[PDB]
């Protein structure tokens, strides 16, 4: 199908005023004549609600921020549903709601919605009553899970509140006959739930489904005579507000006040009454919030002699590898981790980027020269000549292992532990490799080796969030 109508119409949006509107039953629990304060998603009073029109084709895909309030004048059944979804395309499930005249159909399929989804309407002359509806909503709809059928949801103003909470799609509706001229009325009316579909999909955008007649037909246009009746629908957005819902004796919400709307309503809420006596009341507290953080720490000191091992003018042989202790310094692992000069860099336990935050008691550097074919031996629970007659790693926690090919510098002076010499010929697995193992001592003593601590500029005369040397 999929005839597109949105040729060029690009008028700027118009806002009417949702006076006191879209107050539903935010609860399934009966109340006597009590002034109950509820905190939930609501449409704030006297808010600017956008005003779209049946004519001008007005079916833009709109954002489903937290849940919307949908109102509609429509003396004739011209609004036929909504296509809530995320992408409104394939590869993402979308929700479709449509009612014909005597039945409402709800589907959550992998729809292939059109750019201008709507429903054609036709009246056959033998019986002028069947409004023979044609679907121009989607081209493909397959592989879906939810399908619910009931009596239809629908100057006969109709109001809806859709909200997507924790896998549930909740619909609250209220249909009222209205006499006012064009816009939303003023009388308070409380929406009450229709259904709670366990749809469980993500909804971020939505679009209403129109019913268009075909007034005329040019031979090839498909977009010739789609007259759009005469109606109007308004789309408001639910915001988390606190209300004070006056329940009746019977449990009907006869009135409400919007706490965050203005100081008077806030007072009515905090006093839990619709009438406030003359006086002064305390409602809340003002607090200036911080605008930025300032973190700041001691001033950079001695660096760990990461200045001595990987350099070594000569490395010791693996039969008599060296074990140097390093302590009481700041260990910048970022430089070595960013360095591309290392052929291999395997760390166990902690990612190499978090070592700046972590602290240790001591660190030991096991430095020796091996071959690339023997690099696999530096691992817990490994066997082989090196692991069995030479440096052997424990089965337990290991630190970090660093290796790199050293052909240029080290290619019979190097022996391996009955002792044999490497055939290092300066001409890949037989080239020399230098290996340094970082073993961490994390319990032996109070911590003295730690990463540095990035400082930030200081800002004065503003409420700020600070951290002075741990205070």
């Amino acid at each position, epitope marked *: 199908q999929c005839v597109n109508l949105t040729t060029r119409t690009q008028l700027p949006p118009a806002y009417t005023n949702s006076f006191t509107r879209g107050v539903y039953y935010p609860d399934k629990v009966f109340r006597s004549s009590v002034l109950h304060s509820t905190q939930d998603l609501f449409l704030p009073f006297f808010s600017n609600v956008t005003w779209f029109h049946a004519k001008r084709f007005d079916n833009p895909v709109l954002p489903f921020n937290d849940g919307v309030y949908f109102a509609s004048t429509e003396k004739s059944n011209i609004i036929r549903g909504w296509i809530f979804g995320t992408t409104l395309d394939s590869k993402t499930q979308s929700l479709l709601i449509v009612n014909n005249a005597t039945n409402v159909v709800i589907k959550v399929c992998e729809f292939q919605f059109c750019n201008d989804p709507f429903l054609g309407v036709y009246y*056959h*002359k033998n019986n002028k009553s069947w409004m023979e509806s044609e679907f121009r909503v989607y081209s493909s709809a397959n592989n879906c899970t939810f399908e619910y059928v009931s009596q239809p949801f629908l100057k006969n103003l109709r109001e809806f509140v859709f909200k997507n909470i924790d896998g549930y799609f909740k619909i609250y509706s209220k249909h009222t006959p209205i006499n006012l001229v064009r816009d939303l009325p003023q009388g308070f009316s409380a929406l009450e739930p229709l259904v709670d579909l366990p749809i469980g999909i993500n909804i971020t955008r939505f679009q209403t489904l129109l019913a268009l007649h075909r007034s005329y037909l*040019t031979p090839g246009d*498909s977009s010739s005579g789609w007259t759009a009746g005469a109606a109007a629908y308004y789309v408001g957005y639910l915001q988390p507000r606190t209300f004070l819902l006056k329940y009746n004796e019977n449990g009907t919400i006869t009135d409400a006040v919007d706490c965050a709307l203005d100081p008077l309503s806030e007072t009515k809420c905090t006093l839990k009454s619709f009438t406030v006596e003359k006086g002064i009341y305390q409602t809340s507290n003002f607090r200036v919030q911080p605008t930025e953080s300032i973190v700041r720490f001691p001033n950079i000191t001695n660096l760990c002699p990461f200045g001595e091992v990987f350099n070594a003018t000569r490395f010791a042989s693996v039969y008599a590898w060296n074990r140097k202790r390093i302590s009481n310094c700041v260990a910048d692992y970022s430089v070595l981790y960013n360095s591309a000069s290392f052929s291999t860099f395997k760390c166990y336990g902690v990612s190499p980027t978090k070592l700046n935050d972590l602290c240790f008691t001591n660190v030991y550097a096991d430095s020796f020269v091996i071959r690339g074919d023997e690099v696999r031996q530096i691992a817990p629970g490994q066997t082989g000549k090196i692991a069995d007659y030479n440096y052997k790693l424990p089965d337990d926690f290991t630190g970090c292992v660093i290796a790199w090919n050293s052909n240029n510098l080290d290619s019979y002076n190097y022996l391996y532990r009955p002792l044999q010499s490497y055939g290092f010929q300066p001409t890949v697995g037989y080239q020399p490799y230098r290996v340094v193992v970082l073993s961490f001592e994390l319990l032996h003593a109070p911590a003295t080796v730690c990463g540095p601590k990035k400082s930030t500029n200081l800002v004065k005369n503003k409420c700020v969030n600070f951290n002075f040397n741990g205070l």
Partner: antibody
Amino acid sequence: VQLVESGGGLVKPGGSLRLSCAASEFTFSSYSMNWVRQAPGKGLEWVSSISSSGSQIYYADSVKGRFTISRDNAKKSLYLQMNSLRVEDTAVYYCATNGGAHSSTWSFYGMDVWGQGTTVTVSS
Amino acid sequence: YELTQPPSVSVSPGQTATITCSGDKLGDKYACWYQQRPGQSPVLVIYQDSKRPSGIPERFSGSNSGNTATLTIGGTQAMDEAAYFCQAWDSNTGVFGGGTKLTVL
């Protein structure tokens, strides 16, 4: 839209063929298509129909179980199977746009965009 | 289902043409009306028994009720000489008429 038919040619009875019908602009999808023949000296007489989604397929009685109409909106063209030929399958074949979407709306429109037909001759 | 049309109708240019379509209980069905001149693909002239697509001149007048559906060309001219086909749908079977035959004298 503008439609062009192709694939019609001489074949002996009992053979096979595949008619073609390509569209002009992507408004192809919004059109239910229909095939109709012209016997070389006779009137319009309907062949079969297929909807915009391709989910109704309805053939004429004289042609049931021979023909399989298929539609691909992505390649934006209409196809008709030939099978097990009559001799009086010989005709010029028209591919025709309804504009309705489903079963229930084909009666409300005329068959209104029409490619220049392709002639199929079925002779021994 | 059947559509019965007179084999031929002859009207002098400038006159009024009239063309029917008979068959069973017809007026409970939308009947389309079809031009096709010799050697050409046809063209619509009526649908839904009273509608005229855009570009269709106002002379191409017709309506349906009862057991016959009619086509009227007021102010006939030399352009008009063509074959005209009645059409209808029967339980989703497109049904074409025999086809009346213009002769613009």
